[PDB]
Amino acid sequence: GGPETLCGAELVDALQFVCGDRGFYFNKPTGYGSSSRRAPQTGIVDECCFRSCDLRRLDMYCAPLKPAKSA
């Protein structure tokens, strides 16, 4: 029962809804540079759980999306 925030099972559920049946994945703990380490890039759960992550940004963790019109 946080201050109108998403964290825990509820947070995961929101991710599934936003991402859809497509699913989602988690970014690696390390990549390039040390700036990412300083920032809360450890996990999407911690970012939303602690800080207030926007729905639009949250969609980034969702799986790739394709256009309505086939290419």
Coordinates of N, CA and C in Angstrom, one line a residue:
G1 N 0.9 -1.2 0.0 CA 0.0 0.0 0.0 C 0.9 1.2 0.0
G2 N 1.6 1.5 -1.1 CA 2.4 2.6 -1.2 C 1.6 3.9 -1.6
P3 N 2.3 5.0 -1.6 CA 1.7 6.3 -2.0 C 1.3 6.4 -3.5
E4 N 0.3 5.6 -3.9 CA -0.1 5.7 -5.3 C 1.0 5.3 -6.2
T5 N 1.7 4.2 -5.8 CA 2.9 3.8 -6.6 C 2.7 2.3 -7.0
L6 N 3.5 1.9 -8.0 CA 3.4 0.5 -8.4 C 4.7 -0.3 -8.0
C7 N 4.5 -1.3 -7.2 CA 5.6 -2.1 -6.7 C 5.2 -3.5 -6.2
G8 N 5.9 -4.5 -6.6 CA 5.6 -5.9 -6.2 C 4.8 -6.6 -7.3
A9 N 3.9 -7.5 -6.9 CA 3.1 -8.2 -7.9 C 2.3 -7.3 -8.7
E10 N 1.8 -6.3 -8.1 CA 1.0 -5.3 -8.9 C 1.8 -4.7 -10.0
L11 N 3.0 -4.3 -9.7 CA 3.9 -3.7 -10.7 C 4.1 -4.7 -11.9
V12 N 4.4 -5.9 -11.6 CA 4.5 -6.9 -12.7 C 3.3 -7.0 -13.5
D13 N 2.1 -7.0 -12.9 CA 0.9 -7.1 -13.6 C 0.7 -6.0 -14.5
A14 N 1.1 -4.8 -14.1 CA 0.9 -3.6 -14.9 C 1.8 -3.7 -16.2
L15 N 3.0 -4.3 -16.0 CA 3.9 -4.5 -17.1 C 3.3 -5.4 -18.2
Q16 N 2.7 -6.5 -17.7 CA 2.1 -7.4 -18.6 C 0.9 -6.8 -19.4
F17 N 0.1 -6.0 -18.7 CA -1.0 -5.3 -19.3 C -0.5 -4.3 -20.4
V18 N 0.5 -3.4 -20.0 CA 1.0 -2.4 -20.9 C 1.7 -3.1 -22.1
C19 N 2.5 -4.1 -21.8 CA 3.2 -4.8 -22.9 C 2.3 -5.6 -23.7
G20 N 1.3 -6.2 -23.0 CA 0.4 -7.1 -23.7 C 0.8 -8.5 -23.7
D21 N 0.1 -9.4 -24.5 CA 0.5 -10.8 -24.6 C 1.9 -11.0 -25.2
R22 N 2.4 -9.9 -25.8 CA 3.7 -9.9 -26.4 C 4.8 -10.3 -25.4
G23 N 4.6 -9.8 -24.1 CA 5.6 -10.0 -23.1 C 6.6 -8.9 -23.0
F24 N 7.6 -9.1 -22.1 CA 8.6 -8.1 -21.9 C 9.9 -8.7 -21.4
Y25 N 11.0 -8.0 -21.4 CA 12.3 -8.5 -20.9 C 13.0 -7.4 -20.1
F26 N 14.0 -7.9 -19.4 CA 14.8 -7.0 -18.5 C 16.1 -6.7 -19.1
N27 N 16.6 -5.4 -18.9 CA 17.9 -5.0 -19.4 C 19.0 -5.6 -18.6
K28 N 20.2 -5.7 -19.2 CA 21.3 -6.3 -18.5 C 21.8 -5.3 -17.4
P29 N 22.4 -5.8 -16.4 CA 22.9 -5.0 -15.2 C 24.0 -4.1 -15.6
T30 N 24.7 -4.5 -16.7 CA 25.8 -3.7 -17.2 C 25.8 -3.6 -18.7
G31 N 26.4 -2.6 -19.3 CA 26.4 -2.4 -20.7 C 27.7 -1.6 -21.1
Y32 N 27.6 -0.3 -21.3 CA 28.7 0.5 -21.7 C 28.8 1.8 -20.9
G33 N 29.9 2.1 -20.3 CA 30.1 3.3 -19.5 C 29.8 3.0 -18.0
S34 N 29.9 4.0 -17.2 CA 29.6 3.8 -15.8 C 28.5 4.7 -15.4
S35 N 28.0 5.5 -16.3 CA 26.9 6.4 -16.0 C 25.6 5.6 -15.7
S36 N 25.5 4.5 -16.4 CA 24.3 3.6 -16.2 C 24.3 3.0 -14.8
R37 N 25.5 2.7 -14.4 CA 25.7 2.1 -13.0 C 25.2 3.1 -12.0
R38 N 25.6 4.3 -12.1 CA 25.2 5.3 -11.1 C 23.7 5.5 -11.1
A39 N 23.1 5.5 -12.3 CA 21.6 5.6 -12.4 C 20.9 4.3 -12.0
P40 N 19.7 4.4 -11.6 CA 18.9 3.2 -11.2 C 18.5 2.3 -12.4
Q41 N 19.5 1.8 -13.1 CA 19.3 0.9 -14.3 C 19.5 -0.5 -13.9
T42 N 19.5 -0.8 -12.6 CA 19.6 -2.2 -12.1 C 18.5 -3.0 -12.6
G43 N 17.3 -2.5 -12.5 CA 16.1 -3.2 -12.9 C 14.9 -2.3 -13.1
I44 N 14.0 -2.7 -14.0 CA 12.8 -1.8 -14.2 C 11.9 -1.8 -13.0
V45 N 11.9 -2.9 -12.2 CA 11.1 -3.0 -11.0 C 11.5 -2.0 -10.0
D46 N 12.8 -1.9 -9.8 CA 13.3 -0.9 -8.8 C 13.0 0.5 -9.2
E47 N 13.2 0.8 -10.5 CA 12.9 2.1 -11.0 C 11.5 2.6 -10.8
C48 N 10.5 1.7 -11.2 CA 9.1 2.1 -11.0 C 8.7 2.0 -9.5
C49 N 9.3 1.0 -8.8 CA 9.0 0.8 -7.4 C 9.4 1.9 -6.6
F50 N 10.7 2.4 -6.8 CA 11.2 3.5 -6.1 C 10.8 4.8 -6.7
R51 N 11.4 5.1 -7.9 CA 11.1 6.3 -8.6 C 9.8 6.2 -9.4
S52 N 9.2 7.3 -9.8 CA 7.9 7.2 -10.5 C 8.2 7.1 -12.0
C53 N 8.1 5.9 -12.6 CA 8.4 5.7 -14.0 C 7.1 6.0 -14.8
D54 N 7.3 6.7 -15.9 CA 6.2 7.1 -16.8 C 5.7 5.8 -17.6
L55 N 4.4 5.8 -17.9 CA 3.8 4.7 -18.7 C 4.5 4.6 -20.0
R56 N 4.8 5.7 -20.7 CA 5.4 5.7 -22.0 C 6.8 5.1 -21.9
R57 N 7.6 5.5 -20.9 CA 8.9 4.9 -20.7 C 8.8 3.4 -20.4
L58 N 7.8 3.1 -19.6 CA 7.6 1.7 -19.2 C 7.4 0.8 -20.4
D59 N 6.8 1.3 -21.5 CA 6.6 0.6 -22.7 C 7.9 0.2 -23.3
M60 N 9.0 0.9 -23.0 CA 10.3 0.6 -23.5 C 10.7 -0.8 -23.1
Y61 N 10.4 -1.3 -21.9 CA 10.7 -2.6 -21.4 C 9.9 -3.7 -22.1
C62 N 8.9 -3.3 -22.9 CA 8.0 -4.2 -23.5 C 8.7 -4.8 -24.8
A63 N 8.2 -5.9 -25.3 CA 8.8 -6.5 -26.5 C 8.6 -5.7 -27.7
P64 N 9.4 -5.9 -28.7 CA 9.2 -5.1 -30.0 C 7.8 -5.1 -30.5
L65 N 7.4 -3.9 -31.1 CA 6.1 -3.8 -31.6 C 6.1 -3.6 -33.2
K66 N 5.1 -4.1 -33.8 CA 5.1 -4.0 -35.3 C 4.0 -3.1 -35.7
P67 N 4.1 -2.5 -36.9 CA 3.1 -1.5 -37.4 C 1.8 -2.3 -37.9
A68 N 0.7 -1.6 -37.9 CA -0.6 -2.1 -38.3 C -0.5 -2.6 -39.8
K69 N 0.2 -1.8 -40.6 CA 0.3 -2.2 -42.0 C 1.6 -3.0 -42.2
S70 N 1.5 -4.1 -42.9 CA 2.6 -5.0 -43.1 C 3.6 -4.3 -44.1
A71 N 4.9 -4.6 -44.0 CA 5.9 -4.0 -44.8 C 6.2 -4.9 -46.0

